[PDB]
């Protein structure tokens, strides 16, 4: 039985070498080539595994039910069930049988071709045929396409039909001026190592009407992924790229010739969008005639995915950011439907999924405003908009009397001389401040005072009824919101700062839209939703109904009052409740101070829509309120 344990060990090491793809190591565990021993030499066994297991993309061979006996004094039979992963799926329940030779001090495998695949004999061949699945589409709430498979016009040149000397330079300048491209780019394209005189050299995808073609220029239709909104939804949707050898090594079921989601929803939903490869893996005789079919199924195209996004809201939201850094989230707050998820500045996903130069990609990655960031999913201090939450909490626990007026002198305030040089700042020197006035003028000193009055314990109790620490069920990569770094502030300054929305608070715009939905649902928090078919999850009694009915009329005043911070929106002539906010950011690496500008707005009559917008590191005189009118008109007309 000592020899039986050595034989079982030898089978286990053989299988492990096969599973790790070290075919030579497995081949070195086989006995000499004979008719009663091994059927091939070690190099020929190596080549057989490399050839066949590489053709089928075999990966992850694992065994079970291993039994090892004794058939003679030097021969021991073995058998086991096995499964493996291939480019066509899982090969389950394979019955392997063989023999081992103990013809010295070591035990070897009598290798036969039936330890590649069970039903293989002699010089049998393996055949793999595949049919590629078509990638599913991503569509908006009304069926409008966000990511589709379309026909594209590939502009290119043939260096032979271009010219020899003089006519070549004239036609290059003509094809460069007619399609807006560098003449050095066209020359560098036709002068790369892969090019031959008569080859078609691709230059650019044309996404419109095709102009007149100079000599040498030509258009050819190619099928590929297409993004109709382009940069307006690039961070949300993402792009696809060519599948690499390393992608196939990680997952054999990918098409070794198709596309893979590289970021965004294309990547989060890659499995359902890509479908499954069809075809057949079969063993054939030495003269190509099929003996056994190992795996076979028809192709399954990708399922379509339907979002809550409104394509026109998404485009308007993005365009309103005018290429500056910022984001906009629009929802229907009673169901949580995400109508728009805009991030700016952005990148061209069509340019990304086709041909992208290294210079253009480096311009994207080295842009200080970082267009690759999904700003709607990045944590920010929410800014002084957060006053609403602090007020609601203070109204629920009786700390805040809506009519009690604090007396505030000046633009700076601090609790005690213990704060040193730090002071809470406000913009408007209003002397008599009650809650309504603090909301209309966005008074941080009022909020700081009331937060310190409430105290850390009552404040955290109110905050913990929200979604801090929770992971939202959304197919968007995202960290959970936090109140602060640790579970205590351990600082009156930090407590005050958090009160008006800028301490160690980190909340991304989607989590902000979730928290602010209590003002559209009488204190019920409605979790946001991106997939159209999903059910509406919510969370009841996050703040009191009395708090909502006290604060929303003041939020109407933020728009209607002549000194309200959102008064420029009263031009719209629509029922509006809004709150503006700012946040000052200045870390150790920052030159001077940078400001973020925020806007929150919703319809207080029907609660049909809600919007949170932010401008990051705003230019002087810019604000999110300045940019919101167009989206608000659209939402108010189409979402009652």
mmCIF file of C-alpha atoms in Angstrom, residues 33 68 74 91 109 162 171 196 213 215 235 246 263 326 342 347 380 426 432-433 474 484 494 513 526 555 593:
data_model
loop_
_atom_site.group_PDB
_atom_site.id
_atom_site.type_symbol
_atom_site.label_atom_id
_atom_site.label_comp_id
_atom_site.label_asym_id
_atom_site.label_seq_id
_atom_site.Cartn_x
_atom_site.Cartn_y
_atom_site.Cartn_z
ATOM 1 C CA UNK A 33 8.194 4.793 -24.854
ATOM 2 C CA UNK A 68 -5.482 3.262 -7.529
ATOM 3 C CA UNK A 74 4.906 -3.720 -11.498
ATOM 4 C CA UNK A 91 -16.265 19.732 -19.612
ATOM 5 C CA UNK A 109 2.601 6.978 -15.800
ATOM 6 C CA UNK A 162 -1.709 58.283 -54.102
ATOM 7 C CA UNK A 171 -3.097 64.438 -52.322
ATOM 8 C CA UNK A 196 3.032 47.788 -48.007
ATOM 9 C CA UNK A 213 -12.601 61.687 -51.907
ATOM 10 C CA UNK A 215 -6.884 60.582 -55.063
ATOM 11 C CA UNK A 235 -18.026 57.440 -17.940
ATOM 12 C CA UNK A 246 -3.952 37.525 -21.316
ATOM 13 C CA UNK A 263 -14.734 50.342 -18.084
ATOM 14 C CA UNK A 326 -18.329 68.553 -12.362
ATOM 15 C CA UNK A 342 -23.234 63.061 -16.152
ATOM 16 C CA UNK A 347 -13.486 61.361 -23.279
ATOM 17 C CA UNK A 380 -16.864 64.540 -1.975
ATOM 18 C CA UNK A 426 -20.415 83.200 6.279
ATOM 19 C CA UNK A 432 -30.925 88.143 13.231
ATOM 20 C CA UNK A 433 -30.887 84.553 11.939
ATOM 21 C CA UNK A 474 -25.847 49.436 -8.340
ATOM 22 C CA UNK A 484 -15.777 60.868 9.320
ATOM 23 C CA UNK A 494 -14.665 68.802 13.251
ATOM 24 C CA UNK A 513 -29.448 62.075 -4.312
ATOM 25 C CA UNK A 526 -35.776 55.919 -1.624
ATOM 26 C CA UNK A 555 -36.367 75.680 0.343
ATOM 27 C CA UNK A 593 -7.768 77.190 -1.745
#
